[PDB]
Amino acid sequence: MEIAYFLGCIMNNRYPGIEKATRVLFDKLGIELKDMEGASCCPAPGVFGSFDKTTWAAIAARNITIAEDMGADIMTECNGCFGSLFETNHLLKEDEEMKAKINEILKETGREYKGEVNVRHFAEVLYNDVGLDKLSELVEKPLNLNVAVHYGCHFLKPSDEINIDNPERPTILDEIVEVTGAKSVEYKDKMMCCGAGGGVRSRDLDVALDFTREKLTNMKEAGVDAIVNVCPFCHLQFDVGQMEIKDKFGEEFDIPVLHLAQLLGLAMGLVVDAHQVCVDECLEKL
């Protein structure tokens, strides 16, 4: 099938390995990814939603109109971008006054929002449109890895609108991980935030790094080889905040951070040089 592909900022501007692994995986699955030419920031919900709702909604709607013109659903492999675009989409679908205001704003750009497309998440597409049996077929390398799955806040919440899985005790990402042969390890406060969302990372790096330090402490207590996430924002937090924690508190955690696409690429046959935490030991442990 076909699906519009939204990149965001971090994945295409800081971690191209995620993009490369996703592209390779999705042609291996007979799904065509169509680029959304001219796409911009989702925009990042934390700052723009906090400063002005109209600007955030207008930019997100302009991004959605690209996929609408392409006549395909948007697919996102970022919790932040998925949250922003999903919220904008159904907010504009479920009311007309906000849609009218956003369309009046977009008129100057020559675009019109129609609400004829759906926003979908990488992991949800893999679970539903592909299936666990279809992905088990493409594992050439059973992996030997104790993995700490980080769901992220905006993958499943607010669950009243998303309806993908249970926010408290989800299983979807654990099943997708265990498809590859890696073992998902339960650790304390698994569903806790990484600390990057909501703009906190840009306003108080100490608080965000405290969030990250707490989960890294729990993760290390659980004895996990790597962290697997579905958000470039969470990826960047877990990757750069580890070095920041080392620089500030001298607290050493060396747990490589992997996107779900990269983990699926390790089984099945990564631009790890972009990662601030070396992944070489983890690969050698395989």
Partner: protein
């Protein structure tokens, strides 16, 4: 001296009914029926390590204490993780109220220079996290293009983003200077 005759008593001088009505009309009406159980504060990961108390934020929004809220720094300790909203027994849209209060604080002028920097980055390039040279080399090496199919590549997309920004008044909100391209 511990004497402070103004910060230790609430009278009608500390209350603005217009502010609460405006918050309620903007999409946060559910705050009207919070019964102050404290589940949100117990669920908050920012309340365990900062003076941020979401329950008291909801209470102050309902009472009309506008100045006590918009000027409050702890308002910016919420990561919008939605745990409180997922656990509220009255189904209050806590995060919506938090974001509306943040919007009012920003218009009142309580914005952080780093958030202004991110906004200026979006105005300049259309990306909140613009690309740097090292990642350009990495993209070139791996097999992707030097610039992604985004506003980094298409100037017309950047012009569309900038007119949206001008239309919504975001530049005046963050005090952007188009003439010099600087945060004035």
């Amino acid at each position: 001296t511990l004497l402070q005759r103004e910060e230790n008593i609430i009278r009608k001088g500390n209350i603005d009914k217009e502010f609460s009505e405006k918050i309620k009309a903007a999409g946060g009406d559910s705050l009207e029926y919070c019964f102050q159980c404290g589940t949100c504060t117990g669920s908050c990961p920012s309340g365990r390590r900062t003076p941020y108390r979401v329950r008291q934020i909801i209470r102050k929004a309902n009472v009309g204490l506008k100045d006590e809220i918009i000027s409050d720094p702890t308002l910016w300790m919420c990561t919008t993780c939605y745990s409180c909203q997922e656990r509220c027994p009255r189904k209050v849209k806590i995060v919506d109220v938090v974001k509306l209060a943040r919007n009012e604080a920003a218009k009142a002028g309580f914005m952080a220079p780093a958030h202004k920097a991110v906004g200026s980055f979006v105005i300049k390039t259309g990306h909140g996290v613009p690309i740097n040279d090292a990642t350009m080399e990495l993209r070139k090496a791996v097999g992707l293009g030097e610039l992604p199919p985004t506003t980094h590549q298409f100037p017309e997309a950047l012009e569309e983003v900038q007119k949206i920004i001008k239309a919504t008044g975001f530049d005046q909100l963050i005090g952007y200077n188009w003439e010099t391209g600087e945060l004035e």
